[PDB]
Symmetry: D3
Subunit: 156 residues, 6 copies
């Protein structure tokens, strides 16, 4: 069978975007992931109007309200909460989605790029996570048998 995921990932820094690209590739090769019916924030911004390209909407309460809800809905309707984590550039946005994921009883999986694996991550991120793998493990990670496991890196 196949499980769907919420692609929790930033797009602010270059490193964030580098991971984003590797993450999608890995997920495409994964046989237990139904990527088409999954939810990816970028591909689901309120009626195509994402602020960073046409910024009048940064102050638009309606746009913000819709985008926020669309995201929360994208987490609760999908099976796995996937968070592309970068130790040196942690995102408050992703953090909130992790805690929300917890409340929705979802398997919270964190993926750290191989180069950063080991670097101290925030304590709360360490505690909420159900497992923390290396980016290279992603493509073969079996989402049909999700299991608990401690991040073998450090906290701060």
């Amino acid at each position: 069978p196949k499980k769907t995921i919420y692609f929790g990932a930033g797009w602010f820094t270059d490193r964030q975007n580098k991971a984003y690209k590797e993450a999608m590739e890995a997920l495409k090769e994964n046989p237990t992931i139904d990527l088409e019916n999954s939810y990816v924030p970028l591909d689901n911004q309120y009626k195509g109007i994402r602020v960073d390209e046409h910024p009048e909407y940064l102050h638009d309460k309606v746009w913000a309200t819709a985008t926020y809800n669309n995201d929360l809905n994208g987490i609760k309707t999908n099976d796995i909460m996937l968070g592309v984590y970068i130790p040196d550039e942690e995102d408050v946005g992703l953090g909130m989605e992790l805690g929300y994921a917890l409340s929705q009883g979802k398997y919270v999986l964190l993926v750290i790029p191989d180069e950063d694996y080991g670097k101290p991550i925030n304590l709360m991120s360490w505690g909420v996570s159900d497992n923390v793998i290396k980016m290279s493990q992603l493509k073969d990670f079996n989402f049909n048998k999700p299991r608990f496991d401690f991040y073998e890196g450090a906290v701060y």
Copy 2:
């Protein structure tokens, strides 16, 4: 009546710590806050040990587990979720705590330093918050009649 809070505020930078101190002072003055029974993270780390003071605990799974568990317990057993926020120094740990407090039916209140007030904040942070105020309002905020409200500034 008086409300107890969970003091969510990072202590990882000079600005954060400045805000941390300021907020602590405002609360001691707030007639509607029982600070003596509130939960303050840095005063509840497992074994009373801070990892910055004792790096030998950086990979101690037991320390991480207890400290994490103690914190979730602080959020769930207290009335209000307080989040000292720095727009350009956003804490992923605080983000998670916002989502969890949300899951526990708590009133989420962000406090932004006066100087920083107005700066754009992460979309998800703007979403979970029930209200957001300046540091200089924290001293009088009536916690017995917590109401909802939008942030004046923008989101990114």
Copy 3:
């Protein structure tokens, strides 16, 4: 001790409003109720504007969003969920609030006008309720020792 409530009661009809007033009076007399800190919907509409008084807000998504959010916040931050009920004038808005209060671990208490007491109520309303009482008991109900009980009347 004293308990705060979320005053769930429709104001869309003559009978509803009559019940609304009656209940408000009973609560002011109840020694176990802190009405001064309770949440009453009509006193917390966004911007202080009622849509019946200002129809220009009928399609205002921001007004709807804030008012809705303020209400959910009233339910979650208060002790008891009070529902003024009219068997043959059942409010769908109140129904939703019953399910949400249920989700928030709140004690759900329905108050039916003496005259209407005994009339059949919707199955789902009879289910979520923790107890249901006549309007004339509301004045003395001990909110400090909230117990469960079946409605004497029937369901439809």
Copy 4:
């Protein structure tokens, strides 16, 4: 893939029943709906004994208890909460199921018959809903990619 649904719909008024019939038809033609393994209240009344045809059970606490629980179970085990909504004849029953649906992290979809689309609906119904479509949109609505969207009608 296919998602299952809880068919939340009344059967009290003629209009309610008219929508009920159109709703089922639409769902039969929908390729993303597994209608057979879904839950529909009528087809699941406690051991065939629905009150309106053999009414001694209106006062039977056991019958009411079983029917209520069977419904709540029908919502939590299925994927989508479908509510056939009629603006002029809103149902408190359906409302409670909507709020409960929320607590269970379910996608709440509302379907209003094309003739009524636009008519003001209760505020709480507007806020709980994840999306509100026209009856004619049902048959082609893709339940594999549920998304957020505001009801373009009015509130009250």
Copy 5:
């Protein structure tokens, strides 16, 4: 301030009842506990009838339903979940109440008889608990500052 509890403690054996009595006495002495408003199961059975005193209620679905509902209500409307625990006489009913109290954001506190303290307890019980103490500490435990902690003994 003072905290109310839900008195979870089995009364099905000589030892259990001995612990039951002991704990009741410690609480009457505890300055931080409002026992007068706490919920004690045996004092809230439906109709005031114990099934051991009236076996004709052994298969009464209504009695079971009300009593069960009253208990869940006691857990959700009170502050602390207290669990009087006997390592070699573990109550499945108490186990369930631990998971539910956990679901309601309550502080779970196990009290083990001094003599029994140190004996291994079930893994799941050791997990949900926020803290576990000897019977002789219950008299002074500060319920206003509930903290997390591991059990000294083992698990099985």
Copy 6:
């Protein structure tokens, strides 16, 4: 379609183990159960190190923490909470998992061996359960259409 399950069952007593064996057999013959992708505690003990065969880990906080979380994760990621219940030898462990199952919105199914069916079970177990069948009914129980039903035995 097929649903997955959390195999909640003890292995302490001979009778517990007798039921365990019959339970697995029944589940193998069941066409609506995807047994391979399900979760069974024994087959998932923290890195093969189960205490009862190499007991130094009874006092290992890390082992206990991991095993506990792995179990909770096994319940929330799977569809049905299956509890192999033995009236004469109830398990506190299983009870906690039942209440947790409730919080996760899972269908809670109890299976009592035919010889014991009818024997009084704990009240809390009776109330949390969504249905209670005889062991012989298991293999043909359709998990695609889970329904509510009262245990026809007694309580205590």
